[PDB]
Design an enzyme around this catalytic site. Structure first.
Site, PDB file in Angstrom:
ATOM      1  CG  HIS B   4      -1.870   1.090   1.370  1.00 55.22           C
ATOM      2  ND1 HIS B   4      -2.932   1.304   0.523  1.00 55.22           N
ATOM      3  CD2 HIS B   4      -1.974   2.026   2.349  1.00 55.22           C
ATOM      4  CE1 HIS B   4      -3.618   2.360   0.935  1.00 55.22           C
ATOM      5  NE2 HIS B   4      -3.063   2.810   2.046  1.00 55.22           N
ATOM      6  CB  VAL B  30       3.358  -1.497  12.633  1.00 57.24           C
ATOM      7  CG1 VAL B  30       3.617  -2.965  12.286  1.00 57.24           C
ATOM      8  CG2 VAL B  30       3.627  -0.626  11.425  1.00 57.24           C
ATOM      9  CB  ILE B  33      -3.489  -1.736  12.739  1.00 52.79           C
ATOM     10  CG1 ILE B  33      -3.884  -0.389  13.354  1.00 52.79           C
ATOM     11  CG2 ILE B  33      -4.524  -2.168  11.675  1.00 52.79           C
ATOM     12  CD1 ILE B  33      -4.131   0.742  12.348  1.00 52.79           C
ATOM     13  CG  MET B  36      -1.216  -1.269   9.505  1.00 50.68           C
ATOM     14  SD  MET B  36      -0.602   0.157  10.438  1.00 50.68           S
ATOM     15  CE  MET B  36       0.468   0.970   9.311  1.00 50.68           C
ATOM     16  CE1 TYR B  69      -3.037   1.754   8.119  1.00 50.76           C
ATOM     17  CE2 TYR B  69      -4.046   1.968   5.962  1.00 50.76           C
ATOM     18  CZ  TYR B  69      -3.212   2.454   6.943  1.00 50.76           C
ATOM     19  OH  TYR B  69      -2.544   3.650   6.741  1.00 50.76           O
ATOM     20  CG  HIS B  72      -7.726  -0.923  13.610  1.00 51.17           C
ATOM     21  ND1 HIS B  72      -7.389  -0.090  14.656  1.00 51.17           N
ATOM     22  CD2 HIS B  72      -7.641  -2.185  14.096  1.00 51.17           C
ATOM     23  CE1 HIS B  72      -7.107  -0.816  15.724  1.00 51.17           C
ATOM     24  NE2 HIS B  72      -7.252  -2.090  15.410  1.00 51.17           N
TER      25      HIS B  72
END
EC number: 4.4.1.26
Lengths: 100, 98
Positions: B4, B30, B33, B36, B69, B72
């Site tokens: 991404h 990171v 989540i 990620m 993500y 979230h």
């Protein structure tokens, strides 16, 4: 370690087969150009910015910004750029050191 | 495996320190989540286009989990606080290959 990032759109007349042959050729330069350490490419699948038209991403890894110049002038790269000059419509180029 | 990729330019009034804090905050998602998997960022040094100044690469298991993500709560909060920081961005999602 630095990443040389290219964001590109091809000319409309260029077919998918041509694009895949183009990227194969680019990836295969790693073998013959000492400065190039790695190459990955990919097609964008989300199309979040269609108004801009970019469709593909290429990441080339170098040991330094300095050594990018050795790649730029290498005869295999000059030839690559010459052969495929008709293929691309526009591009964005970025050079950076990936970090946290 | 999908990347991404965000290509970004900040508003002119945003300071370098603000940018580094912004990226620090983003990197620290990171941990929080599950979707990620990794993040890197960097400043463009070549400035040959003109425009965009920074690059962010976020790693995901699949295109499908990018959505996990996006919605979230930690990411929603991040966007709420910092979306005002940027002038424009380009987003790309792709599977890096040879």
């Amino acid at each position: 370690a630095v990443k040389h990032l290219i964001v590109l759109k091809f000319k409309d007349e260029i077919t998918e087969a041509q694009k895949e042959e183009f990227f194969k050729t680019w990836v295969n330069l790693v073998n013959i150009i000492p400065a190039m350490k790695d190459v990955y490419w990919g097609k964008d699948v989300t199309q979040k910015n269609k108004e801009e038209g970019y469709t593909h991403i290429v990441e080339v890894t170098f040991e330094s910004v300095e050594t990018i110049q050795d790649y730029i002038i290498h005869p295999a790269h000059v030839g690559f750029g010459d052969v495929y000059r008709s293929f691309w419509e526009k591009l964005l180029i970025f050079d950076y050191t990936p970090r946290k």
